[PDB]
Amino acid sequence: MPVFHTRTIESILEPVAQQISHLVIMHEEGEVDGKAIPDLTAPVAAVQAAVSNLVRVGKETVQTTEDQILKRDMPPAFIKVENACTKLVQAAQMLQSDPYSVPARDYLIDGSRGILSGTSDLLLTFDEAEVRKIIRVCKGILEYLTVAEVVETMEDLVTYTKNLGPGMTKMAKMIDERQQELTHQEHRVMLVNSMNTVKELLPVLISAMKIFVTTKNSKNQGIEEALKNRNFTVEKMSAEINEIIRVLQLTSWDEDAWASKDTEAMKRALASIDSKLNQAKGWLRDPSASPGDAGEQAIRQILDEAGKVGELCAGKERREILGTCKMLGQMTDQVADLRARGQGSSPVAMQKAQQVSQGLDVLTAKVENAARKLEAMTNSKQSIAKKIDAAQNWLADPNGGPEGEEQIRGALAEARKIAELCDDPKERDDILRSLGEISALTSKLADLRRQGKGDSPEARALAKQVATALQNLQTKTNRAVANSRPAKAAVHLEGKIEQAQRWIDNPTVDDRGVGQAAIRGLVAEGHRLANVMMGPYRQDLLAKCDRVDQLTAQLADLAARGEGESPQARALASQLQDSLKDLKARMQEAMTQEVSDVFSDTTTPIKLLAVAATAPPDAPNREEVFDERAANFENHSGKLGATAEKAAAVGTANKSTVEGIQASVKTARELTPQVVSAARILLRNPGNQAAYEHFETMKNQWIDNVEKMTGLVDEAIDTKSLLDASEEAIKKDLDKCKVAMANIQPQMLVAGATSIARRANRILLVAKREVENSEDPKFREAVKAASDELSKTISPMVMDAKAVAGNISDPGLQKSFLDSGYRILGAVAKVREAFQPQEPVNQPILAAAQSLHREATKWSSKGNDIIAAAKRMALLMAEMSRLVRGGSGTKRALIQCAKDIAKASDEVTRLAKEVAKQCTDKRIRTNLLQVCERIPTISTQLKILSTVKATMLGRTNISDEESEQATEMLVHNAQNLMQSVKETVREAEAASIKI
């Protein structure tokens, strides 16, 4: 199982790689050609030396490093490579004795493998304890949070503030060094961007205690609004500690996150769908007074997030949730047809809409059917991971004839079938040929009695037999979970398109369950983006969605009967790609009209909440308004949070942005209730300066959080989208000033008048965001220069706002005040003028191979520098697809291609670097330097893993399930490579147009 975990594990195995390479080159040539063998000892001594250099350290690491868990498995570890070292000894003996000795010719490949298997192991057997240096530190930080719970005294917190000093500074000096070590970037980012947010809460945790100092008033105990504020954060600190446990525990690419990230996505659904249900419920319950604009925002959204629950399970049941959503949604749509026409009144159609009120309880069952069939599928995945790790527990003490030690392993082996007793309700074909595989382990359970009775030599013998049997068992348990949830919605924008576009070409020969699930997302986001819109746009955009949603069942039947090759099936899927083109291109064009209403004035709840927080004299008309402004603060953030997710679901960015967008939305979802009690405990512990400033912590936490959400949502869409929706708004709102100069009401002026200032500086807020990010000053200069044209006009607007507030029926003055704002628009469009660029066995490898080629055709360049680089690598990946199970005499080209796979990915590494310094934007380089870290990382690993496989090939003396455990590492890190380089070849060229 040759890992590539630590930086140093790479830089030692790659010397072992080029050694064992030329070793097994000599092994093949004496077999396929029968070459007279040259020397061995100058390799043989040199290959064991770099081994033994670790080993006498590992001798000392047994003898003087005193981990009382390392001494159980490290002493079996380093003898095994030393056993493999002794295999190298007789090889150099007998082949120098006889180069033609065919047993000694093939007493060579077996020694070449157990070294390099163990060489990866022994490097990891060191980093067993080295990473375990960090866990009990973090466990103490968890117990510091338990020590945080201990605190009941004002005298405590002073030195417990002094306690975190040696706490986090050791956490600083350990984690930040580990930041440079591990070489999976998006796996690296899970540590440091966890750890800075761990650092961000350190005074916030103290301020949680210092607002708990405000619980050390006369109300020492109490209901304590700030108690959950403490209790959330200490859970949230323990959340990111538990997260960086497993990120440091993890050794290669993750294969369990999608049994987890869905489970929180359940909780952002199931705890949100029951919430907006209650406003969905009474809205349809009121038949006549429901004009399809306010509670309709609940109605469509409950459906569309049930559609996001409709990405959890598969098969027929996945069809059934989109069946019931279109059922009770179109029953509301005809109610929307009956009401808006006029005759949709209370008594005639109160049972017609009751169809939906009984219909929503289907979707209550539809989500929990997706829930329990998810979580039970996940509970079994870890329990089988525990019991194969409990499989060494009896192997830690295999005894002759004891009572309980074989009694417990039967209670172990009873639990190993619980996986197949839960993999059976989800699948039948591969299960009934794996219910015999666990029944084959019942024959190994029958073999437990010869070591259940007293016998030592067979006990280790079937231990190796159950070693290959349990490694077969977990792998076939792993394959069960794989095919039983479809390929999820690739969360970024074109990933939902690219999980669909191939499925338009030929859904007959296809990928499982993804394409039908792909445009499930687009109809869930088309309906979401239609939900907030206007009357002639609501039903306008809902109709273009169901224009595609009717194409689904027709595409579901033109291959159910018939197939997709026929041109009467091609023409049926012809205009669907036309319809889906306008589906997105109207959505993201109307996405920016959905941000500029609620984001442009994003600070405005808080300061109005602040004056609601700062000055109560305990007069009336204050505290319920404070609740109302909190209710504003809920739904303003409730839009702000949800609107960002829509802009996350459609925003052109990378993974690191859109995850950090929704992570900011998570902190927008986290900290918005945090402000609620914190501003409340200001008004529960009234007027106290010791209580006051914790708001100014947490609001300056929140505003910065919202600003770092703002600036990223600003970074999410292009600004040309963000400008024009704002630019048409100020054209709209100045016309609203014109009719407010007609309809005489001066207080409605000064709200909309200062609303212009909320947008004007906001243009300058993201003008500065351009300024810091741009490499080119000549396309930065007017972004600063013409910004002052706003700055010398934003406040003079407010000046004669006050003048017409003195005399609203004064013409000329109001003509000047209208002409004060009129010269704003002469430059806001000039900001657009600035942002105008005018100023033959195992073939999933072949499935990975063809993907880069269509991505390679997805660019037009003068010189195919990265394009041909992607081309011949995908060709060699196509050679990798054919050679993965080829003839035994072909293992030389196995590595020789993988040498080029190391080489060409190091060219894709290099060519990504050469234009990163050429590019004229800093965000595109930063996201490139995010994505280009893995390009040289796994490049040499596949060169390493081919040498592992070249040993494995032609063996016929090993369990072949271990060979496919080695083969799957090739095909996954094929797909780790190919999906990575597909991201780079487009996006570097998506960077290349900026020159």
Side-chain angles (χ1 to χ4, degrees), residues 201-221:
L201 202 144
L202 301 179
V204 177
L205 178 59
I206 297 165
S207 76
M209 299 297 177
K210 293 297 183 292
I211 198 64
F212 198 80
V213 169
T214 73
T215 70
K216 199 57 69 70
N217 51 356
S218 178
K219 49 178 75 174
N220 300 114
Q221 69 275 16

Side-chain angles (χ1 to χ4, degrees), residues 200 378 649 708 926:
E200 285 174 353
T378 300
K708 75 182 287 186
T926 304

Side-chain angles (χ1 to χ4, degrees), residues 329-469:
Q330 293 301 110
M331 289 195 288
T332 57
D333 188 74
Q334 54 85 27
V335 166
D337 293 330
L338 264 291
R339 285 171 176 167
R341 174 61 181 85
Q343 70 271 13
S345 64
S346 180
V348 53
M350 56 185 177
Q351 291 294 106
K352 179 66 65 66
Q354 194 271 332
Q355 299 167 355
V356 181
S357 72
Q358 67 189 357
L360 57 88
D361 202 4
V362 174
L363 282 172
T364 67
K366 292 299 188 183
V367 296
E368 60 196 1
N369 288 318
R372 276 83 50 85
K373 274 75 177 175
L374 180 68
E375 53 89 19
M377 183 176 173
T378 300
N379 284 119
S380 296
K381 192 263 178 185
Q382 287 76 238
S383 296
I384 194 63
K386 293 297 289 294
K387 295 297 185 291
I388 65 163
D389 292 334
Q392 288 85 19
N393 194 2
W394 60 267
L395 190 145
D397 54 1
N399 300 116
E403 177 68 30
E405 194 270 331
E406 284 86 4
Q407 180 60 255
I408 56 171
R409 69 177 68 184
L412 292 176
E414 193 272 330
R416 273 72 172 263
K417 197 180 185 294
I418 302 297
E420 289 83 5
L421 288 176
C422 296
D423 293 334
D424 188 74
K426 71 184 188 59
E427 208 272 332
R428 296 290 181 181
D429 192 4
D430 204 0
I431 298 301
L432 270 296
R433 67 186 65 252
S434 295
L435 288 172
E437 291 174 355
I438 191 66
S439 297
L441 267 297
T442 66
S443 67
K444 300 304 290 180
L445 181 145
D447 289 331
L448 294 176
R449 271 74 169 175
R450 279 86 59 88
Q451 61 181 353
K453 296 283 102 176
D455 192 78
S456 178
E458 196 272 331
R460 63 177 175 87
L462 84 148
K464 300 295 187 291
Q465 294 175 356
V466 301
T468 65

Side-chain angles (χ1 to χ4, degrees), residues 81-129:
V81 60
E82 185 179 0
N83 291 123
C85 286
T86 54
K87 302 294 187 292
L88 304 177
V89 174
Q90 296 177 356
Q93 291 172 356
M94 294 185 286
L95 287 178
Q96 292 299 110
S97 299
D98 192 2
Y100 290 167
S101 175
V102 183
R105 287 184 184 180
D106 294 335
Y107 198 72
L108 181 64
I109 190 71
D110 52 356
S112 69
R113 196 186 303 175
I115 291 294
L116 194 143
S117 70
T119 310
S120 304
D121 288 329
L122 266 298
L123 290 174
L124 194 66
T125 314
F126 285 169
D127 288 331
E128 287 177 354

Side-chain angles (χ1 to χ4, degrees), residues 674-687:
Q674 296 291 316
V675 177
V676 167
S677 64
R680 182 179 292 112
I681 192 62
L682 179 61
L683 280 76
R684 298 283 77 77
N685 194 2

Side-chain angles (χ1 to χ4, degrees), residues 312-315 318 377 423 426-431 475-487 510-514 844:
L312 271 300
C313 297
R318 183 172 62 93
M377 183 176 173
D423 293 334
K426 71 184 188 59
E427 208 272 332
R428 296 290 181 181
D429 192 4
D430 204 0
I431 298 301
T475 302
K476 301 298 185 292
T477 308
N478 194 2
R479 290 177 63 190
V481 179
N483 292 114
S484 175
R485 284 179 286 170
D510 53 347
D511 194 78
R512 58 175 178 86
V514 53

